[PDB]
């Protein structure tokens, strides 16, 4: 439920 | 060229989703307490409606995370 | 669905966790709504409120399935 | 090794979708009967009845959405 | 291999969406009438809530059509 | 978004038509909700019902944007 | 010739999304104030208040969904 | 609002 993306 | 989003922006959207999940949990605890303090079919019905909406919010937060981290 | 997920495997573990938790909550909730359905009330307002809850149970169910499909396709 | 959705998994979600569509039908029939027994004394009651009927349409559209997303 | 659906099934889902749109229109006319027959902030609020839900149903029917005809 | 729509162009004309109609309805509805907000009621139930309507207006707004994006990407 | 979404179009939908996020913030603050002035005399009132607070979370998640779908 | 697909 916690992440980064690009 | 499908997706074109800044990494920092997507990171801040993940934060906003996290904060909304915390709010949700506090809301579900609030409802557990208030529900547990309580013979009316209407009042019971409103309580069930709130519980449903909490579930709906849970699923939409999970949907929002999944859609966000696949963009 | 297709492959290509682009997020943390750790989140994919924990989102399945919370989705399952939400399915448990839903089942207990549909039990409570069922009980309320047969356990007592002759009022158009009362009937309407109960139908509203019963409908929202289905909306929650379908959104849980949507969240599952999106989770395992994304 | 692994795979997105095992064919049996998409089949088992299709099962729950079937159960939910059947239930939805029973709910819309129940709402129908309430529709004909309904009372015309308070606009609040009418509003609540419209709210429920609307939510049945929302649930209907969301079940079709769940099918389209699942069979993709 | 992304999508794997029978053409007849997708055609029947389009039908069900159409029938639900007709139901929606009759519902919006019903609400126009009942709203037009009517000083209470609660009753007005419930009326606004119903109108909102009709709008929500409209958008979800359009979403369901778009998702269906791209599968 | 990407191309590849797979449905009738005729529907894509008419769905934009109904989405626009729904935006008109929404604007008139937010006007009615605004008016109701300032025009009268000192009750916790009344305040809550109004907040419920005001929230649903936003849900409808976001779903209209979702339907637009999905329509012109699909 | 044509194109899915003109960059200005996605920008103009982003505009409305911004307006809706700002409004949402104002609504959640309004609900907060109602939260502290709230009354504890009827569980029905408490339920309605929980219903509104839940709907603010739903609207929040749907606005983030609208951003993710739009910026795709 | 009315179409077929496959």
| Angle, CA D53 vertex, CA B61 and CA D28 arms, to 5° | 100
Token pair of C14, please? 């924990």
Residue environment code for E43-71, b if the CB has 16+ CB neighbours within 10 A, otherwise e: bbbbbbbbbbbbbbbbbbbbbbbbbbbbb
d(CA C60, CA B48): 12
Is residue D2 in a domain? no
Cα→Cα distances D22→C29, D26, D29, D63, Å: 19, 6, 11, 11
CA atoms of D54 and B42, how far apart (whole Å): 19
The tokens for E42 are: 């609660």
Measured between CA atoms, the residue of chain A closest to residue C14 is A1
| Structural domain includes residue F4 | no
Residue B35 belongs to some domain of the structure: yes
From which experimental method does this structure derive? Answer: X-ray
Query: Is G65 within a domain?
Result: yes
H–E touching, 3+ CB–CB pairs within 8 Å: yes
Number of domains in chain B: 1
DSSP-based three-state secondary structure for C20: helix
Smallest Cβ–Cβ distance between A2 and the set B5, B14, B62 belongs to B14
SS3 content of chain F, % helix, strand, coil (to 5): 80, 0, 20
Are G41 and B37 spatial neighbours (Cβ–Cβ below 8 Å)?
no
Q: Where are the strands (E) in chain C, listed by range?
A: none
B-chain CB neighbours of G42 within 8 Å are 43
Contact status of E47 with chain D (Cβ, < 8 Å): yes
Q: Residue B29 belongs to what domain range? A: 7-68
Reduce the DSSP state of residue B11 to 3 states and report it. Answer: helix
Q: How far apart are CA F7 and CA H2, in angstroms?
A: 10
How many residue pairs from chains A and C have C-beta atoms closer than 8 A? 12
G41 in any annotated domain: yes
Cα–Cα nearest to B40, from B32, B29, B48: B48
User: The tokens of B65 are what?
Assistant: 């995370």
Q: G34 exposed, middle or buried (CB, 10 Å; 0-12, 13-18, 19+)?
A: middle
- Beta-carbon separation of A1 and C15 below 8 A: yes
Q: Report whether C49 contacts B47 (CB < 8 A).
A: no
CB contacts < 8 A (E, F): 94
Q: Is residue E2 part of a domain?
A: no
Q: Is residue B18 part of a domain?
A: yes
Answer whether H5 sits within 8 Å of E65, measured CB to CB: no
Q: Is residue C68 part of a domain?
A: yes
CA atoms within 13 A on the CB side of F5: 21
B60–chain C Cβ distance below 8 A for any pair: yes
Q: Record the tokens describing residue B48, joined without a space.
A: 């069930």
């Amino acid at each position: 439920a916690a992440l980064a993306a690009a | 060229r499908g997706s074109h989003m800044t990494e920092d922006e997507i990171r801040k959207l993940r934060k906003l989703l996290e904060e909304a999940e915390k709010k949700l949990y506090k809301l579900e605890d609030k409802t557990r307490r208030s529900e547990e303090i309580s013979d009316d079919p209407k009042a019971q019905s409103l309580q069930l409606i709130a519980e449903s909406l909490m579930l709906i919010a849970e699923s939409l937060l999970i949907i929002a995370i999944s859609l966000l981290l696949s963009s």
